[PDB]
Amino acid sequence: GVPDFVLLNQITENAFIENLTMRHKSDNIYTYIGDVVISTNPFKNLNIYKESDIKAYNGRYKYEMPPHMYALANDAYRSMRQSQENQCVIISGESGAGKTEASKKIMQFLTFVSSNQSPNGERISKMLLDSNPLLEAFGNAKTLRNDNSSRFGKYMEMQFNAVGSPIGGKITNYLLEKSRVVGRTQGERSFHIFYQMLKGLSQSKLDELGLTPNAPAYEYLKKSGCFDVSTIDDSGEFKIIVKAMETLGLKESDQNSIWRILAAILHIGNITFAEAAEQRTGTTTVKVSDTKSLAAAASCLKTDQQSLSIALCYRSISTGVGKRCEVISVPMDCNQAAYSRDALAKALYERLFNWLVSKINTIINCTTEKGPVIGILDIYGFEVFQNNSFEQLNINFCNEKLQQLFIELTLKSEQEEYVREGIEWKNIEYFNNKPICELIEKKPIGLISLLDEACLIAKSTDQTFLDSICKQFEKNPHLQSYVVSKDRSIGDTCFRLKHYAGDVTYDVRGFLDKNKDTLFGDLISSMQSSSDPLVQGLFPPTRPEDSKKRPETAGSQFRNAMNALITTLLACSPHYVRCIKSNDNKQAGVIDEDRVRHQVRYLGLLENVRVRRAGFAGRIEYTRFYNRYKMLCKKTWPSFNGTAKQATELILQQHNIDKEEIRMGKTKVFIRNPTTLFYFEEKRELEMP
Description:
The PDB classes it as structural protein/hydrolase. The chain is an alpha/beta fold.
């Protein structure tokens, strides 16, 4: 009748949408693109992931029941069950499209299949449901496009035993946005952990720390631009979070210990540099008139206020293996002072978040069991604001790397599996491997390769670097501007950049100082040699499972963090799930035609289907082509060989048909035009009434 989506009456553009709409309005959410799942997000609890439906899809196949358990899984996730290995699922899409729901679908499908009962196994099924009111507190922030937007890459890992049942899991984060601690547009926030504190502690405790329930009063928080949000109610959320804080195991005693770390950051935030007017003209020294605020930090940091001012304002260098003799120095400009200042407040939080979340699991993470691991991916999605900037460049860059991930896996890796599983396969035309957009920013002579060159040249400002792009390139594909491309739409202070489809114009504000975030010893060394257990805690015993070389900026370190991510993604058994946002009105049962159509277009997912199989009109699976058109040919009866694709050859070679007319491969038979599907039926119709 209507076996899944592959089988359409008309394999065309218009028919593809008409059916897609007919699917959505027929309680058919999940749609198959080619052994790959495409889903959406209801943004709430739907009664379709509960026992009943789970028991429906057990021991059956795809072509037997409606879209829900794409055969590939049953034929791949189970294929490695005899081989005896673990899996890993990757998920992508727009922000808010359920870097969670799509992950939950895996769980609710994963359980039960693992033979149900298990005291330690079903326990996580209960706690992970109580994670929804919890997870939204730590690694989440509000974007103008998404409220529950995670602000850090996450690769969850489900642990199991030598049977198939779950036992526990761990978490791994990444470099994460840099300038979201000090710079942002009026309306957005930085991180919850800060705001949740201010409207939590009693005014009494705040006054003791020289604080006040009002961000505007501060400086660091004032440089952000905004403070209050119209959609979020922090004051009323605190007491609700406290219950969630205790749910894990963070008693008031522990809470107070955590607030000190933030208080330390706030004390750093009340420390600026009253541009010392010691020098009379050009260069300038650094002096602190507001000693009250400066002293407050050193007081809570429990370090010598004097040494702190001398060691930081004046950098030390003289490490001749024997290991250093400090103090020799001389003042420097204000820009560098404010720059080095930020680098301290940026590196402190990075190593904080890492050590913080890792110490939370100490109470949560299962220690009772031990075993392998199955991975799950979740990252921030695509976005476009009124005005783009350096931030969008790095984010959109990740999408290009993400698009490459799929291509490398669902398009390239799978092809190599055909020639490895003893199948007569031939290299079918596939759109460019687009390795040029990658080599243009990795090996010598490249984007971020030239950028690294422009960074360390302290004088080469953002403007000068932008000039190095237009000249070195504007010849290689995927780049334009106002000089080469005659188009007024490109401002003189802006530049055009072509993506995989859409066009985006960026600004060059920040770039360097924002990306660098370099902090050498001299400044760090003063903190590492602290006696307080908290301060030194922010500086773990030297490189935890991340050594290599140490000094080389944090910007270049970002690339390394993302490269180390893909390296471990291309060494396992992938699984593909993509998400799409319903609408911008939070409506139920309403599809935005233009919005959804656009997403499917600029991503080239329909061209993907074509290339995935080979590319043309109507296409049908071999495994399925066989058990369907048998009565047409002779000797294609229970006295068969077994193979499906081989039989197809025997049928077409005996009746003398040009073999180039039909393209042969592993899966998906290729016969041009859909008019032939009738030709098969007719060949069967008027020969046996």
